[PDB]
């Protein structure tokens, strides 16, 4: 598309190596800008990375580590912003891309468009076949105002380097090609100006540019240093509302814009909440609370008294340090319809934690979540009590928003479990991110969930492996109850359909309601089947009801 979100796995090892690259391809496939962290680790020696090839910006840092591919095709990456930084120092880290037990290893960074690095430094280390890194004039890459220009490059090798291309002026190259010559854009400019495309003052870049320029104007930039608001680079985006100089009453500003990453945006993108000031967020500002229009979206707005308290999940005010959901906190979810944060259930949880005398969580305390219907951050389940065949305690969960993703990528994660089906019946949407369901031996009924319906953005997919094989499910009989419209269920039975192509008596499908026959006697409304009065018509006559009380049941 245009923008994608990065990941935040750091150096931690891919739970599903067999889906790991397949993950990456999904996230970055069409992607030109990654709001987040470009993290490429653990990639196996013969591994197509052609999808990486459209990326120009990386809003935070870039981490290439523990790989064996020999190329990582980011020729087009042009500026990193180092919003966030690896080990809090580095906007670009390549570590340990070697061999551990026609050699393996990255041979040339080839970062041949990389002229801008706004914040953070460069750490390159332990890369056996890596050539030309010490050819590079790093201070030309680092921005002027870049506070963190410290740099930590290793040169130990186990192979040797051809010369740079004859076209290399000064022989500094990202690789053996002419294409890889380090373009200089900061140290060679006329006057003190921070970027330029040539030695003449006439070549100096507009002060709002970042990586270079095709010209003198703030329309001629390679990347904006602040905000791209159309063809033009500016320091900030037009405000949302202009005031009346006497009254000081807000007036809707016709040419006003929101800010999303480093762009001046007309309207906030799908899963982000818009805001009073003019910013797009994943978390509201200090003194606000979430709104919703009939228009399906959400906004932040300020509140009437110091705000009505709400449930905070893990990764949040108060639980932001806690790894897992556990007996010591299970109570804190007493009857919440919506959790700001995430829930994760680890081995840690259901096993004890004698390290600080905290008790093993019981399969029945989990029922606190039966009222639960919205999760803003992700759901992550990795242990789960053998007793329970499913995730029914979340059978009223209706949206996982993804605003905070596990390891930067996964809104839904079920792994190493013992469950036999899923039972998230009312789960109609995963707001952002991808599902990873892997290594659950007994898991049937995955195939039935119409996962395409839950997803919102096309960088989204289910990644599954090492589950019970569908063949072994269709075979051993387990399948969608015939009353489940279009064949989609979350498990065995008529309780578990995603849609009912007949009626709904409670949480169950029924081919007909009791308006003709049938004992505890009944009536029909919005495809449902509601009971009539404890004493209305006991008859065998025609259409014997119409309603709940003795108000409307014709006697």
């Amino acid at each position: 598309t245009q923008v994608c979100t990065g990941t935040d796995m750091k150096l931690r090892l891919p739970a599903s190596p067999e889906t790991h690259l397949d993950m990456l391809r999904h996230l970055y496939q069409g992607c030109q800008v990654v709001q987040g962290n470009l993290e490429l680790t653990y990639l196996p020696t013969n591994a197509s990375l052609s999808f990486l090839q459209d990326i120009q910006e990386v809003q935070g840092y870039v981490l290439i580590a523990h790989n064996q591919v020999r190329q990582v095709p980011l020729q087009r990456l042009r500026i990193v912003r180092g919003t966030q930084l690896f080990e809090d120092n580095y906007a670009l880290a390549v570590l340990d891309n070697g061999d551990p037990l026609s050699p393996g290893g990255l041979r040339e960074l080839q970062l041949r468009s990389l002229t801008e690095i706004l914040k953070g430094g460069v750490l390159i280390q332990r890369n056996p076949q890596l050539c030309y890194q010490d050819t590079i004039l790093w201070k030309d890459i680092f921005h002027k105002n870049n506070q963190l220009a410290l740099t930590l490059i290793d040169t130990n090798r186990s192979r040797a380097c051809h010369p740079c291309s004859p076209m290399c002026k000064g022989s500094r190259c990202w690789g053996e090609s002419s294409e890889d010559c380090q373009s200089l854009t900061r140290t060679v400019c006329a006057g003190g100006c921070a970027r330029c495309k040539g030695p003449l003052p006439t070549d100096c870049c507009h002060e709002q540019c970042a990586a270079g320029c095709t010209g003198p104007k703030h329309s001629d930039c390679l990347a904006c240093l602040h905000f791209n608001h159309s063809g033009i680079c500016e320091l900030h985006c037009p405000a949302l509302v202009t005031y009346n100089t006497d009254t000081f009453e807000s007036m809707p500003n016709p040419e006003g814009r929101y800010t999303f990453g480093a762009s001046c945006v007309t309207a906030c993108p799908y899963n982000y909440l818009s805001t009073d000031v003019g910013s797009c967020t994943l978390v509201c500002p200090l003194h606000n609370q979430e709104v919703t229009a009939e228009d399906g979206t959400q906004r932040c707005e300020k509140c009437s008294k110091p705000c009505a308290r709400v449930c905070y999940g893990l990764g949040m005010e108060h639980l932001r340090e806690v790894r897992a959901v556990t007996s010591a906190n299970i109570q804190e979810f007493a009857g919440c319809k919506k959790i700001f944060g995430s829930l994760a259930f680890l081995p840690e949880s259901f096993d004890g934690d004698p390290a600080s005398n905290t008790a093993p969580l019981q399969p029945e305390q989990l029922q606190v979540f039966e009222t639960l219907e919205e999760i803003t951050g992700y759901l992550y389940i990795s242990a789960w009590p053998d007793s329970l065949p499913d995730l029914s305690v979340f059978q009223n969960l209706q949206v996982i928003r993804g605003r905070i993703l596990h390891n930067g990528a996964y809104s839904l994660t079920l792994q190493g479990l013992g469950i036999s089906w899923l039972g998230l019946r009312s789960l109609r949407e995963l707001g952002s991110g991808l599902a990873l369901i892997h290594h659950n031996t007994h898991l049937c009924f995955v195939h039935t969930v119409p996962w395409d319906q839950l997803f919102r953005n096309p960088h989204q997919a289910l990644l599954h492996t090492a589950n019970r094989p569908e063949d072994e499910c269709v075979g051993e009989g387990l399948a969608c109850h015939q009353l489940c419209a279009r064949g989609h269920c979350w498990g065995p039975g008529p309780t578990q359909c995603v849609n009912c192509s007949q009626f709904l008596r409670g949480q169950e499908c029924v081919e007909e309601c009791r308006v003709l026959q049938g004992l505890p006697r009944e009536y029909v409304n919005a495809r449902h089947c509601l009971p009539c009065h404890p004493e209305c018509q006991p008859q065998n006559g025609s259409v014997t009801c119409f309603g709940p009380e003795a108000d409307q049941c014709v006697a």
Partner: antibody, heavy 117, light 111 residues
Framework: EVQLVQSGAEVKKPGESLKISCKGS????????IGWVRQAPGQGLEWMGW????????NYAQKLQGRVTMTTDTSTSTAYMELRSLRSDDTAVYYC??????????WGQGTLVTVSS | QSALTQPASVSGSPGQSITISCTGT?????????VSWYQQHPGKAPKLMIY???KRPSGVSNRFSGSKSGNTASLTISGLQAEDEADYYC??????????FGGGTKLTVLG
């Protein structure tokens, strides 16, 4: 250790084609470039060209053009200088060497190729 | 195409010591710093000393020291340890992605 071992010496008649071999060992063969230089009897060194043993890219001499071809074969760790349409005077010593920073640090033993009528 | 120039000439006196010269154009040594030197004894491969303009492989004697303003190109031997006589070769990298050798010079000590 590091070994570059070349063919036994050659004798070829005018109009024929030469084909020396160079087998490297004890170092990772794909990792380095290999170059060819020759020395006509009691005379100057003359660079012929070099090969990428990793990707197969080749630069040649501009005097030999039309007439040279270097190749490698990763499976067997060997490089193959080939000089066609030999006419005298190519008579020389014909080393192959392992290329560092534009510069060769490990040579072959040599290969006398003699071209007289 | 299109050889660098040296003199076959250096001479010099045991103990110390003189310098060879290269030299060649902007397109070769006068533009690249991939400039290397070789010591060839009669009827042997060349020995590699030194590379990048000024640097010595392991085992190479102290006070082998090439450097200088391009377009030259200047190897220097300092104590004339007795047996240093050899033909001596400069080479450079090239705006045509080619290696190019100098004509060689014959070092020859006195006594």
């Amino acid at each position: 250790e590091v070994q570059l071992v070349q063919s036994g010496a050659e004798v070829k008649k005018p109009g024929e084609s030469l084909k020396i071999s160079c087998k490297g060992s004890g170092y990772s063969f794909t990792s380095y470039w290999i170059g060819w230089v020759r020395q006509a009897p009691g005379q100057g060194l003359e660079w012929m060209g070099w090969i990428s043993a990793y990707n197969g890219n080749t630069n040649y001499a501009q005097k030999l053009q039309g007439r040279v071809t270097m190749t490698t074969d990763t499976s067997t760790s060997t490089a193959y200088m080939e000089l066609r349409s030999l006419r005298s005077d190519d008579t020389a010593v014909y080393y192959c060497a392992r290329e560092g920073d534009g510069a060769f640090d490990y040579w072959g033993q040599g290969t006398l190729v003699t071209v007289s009528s | 195409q299109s050889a660098l120039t040296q003199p076959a000439s250096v001479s010099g006196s045991p103990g110390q010591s003189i310098t060879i010269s290269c030299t060649g154009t902007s397109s070769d040594v006068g533009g690249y710093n991939y400039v290397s030197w070789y010591q060839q004894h009669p009827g042997k491969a060349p020995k590699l000393m030194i590379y990048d303009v000024s640097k010595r492989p392991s085992g190479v004697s102290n006070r082998f020291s090439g450097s200088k303003s391009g377009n030259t190109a200047s190897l220097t031997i300092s104590g004339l340890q007795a047996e240093d006589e050899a033909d001596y070769y400069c080479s450079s990298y090239t705006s045509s992605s080619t290696l190019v050798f100098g004509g060689g010079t014959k070092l020859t000590v006195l006594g």
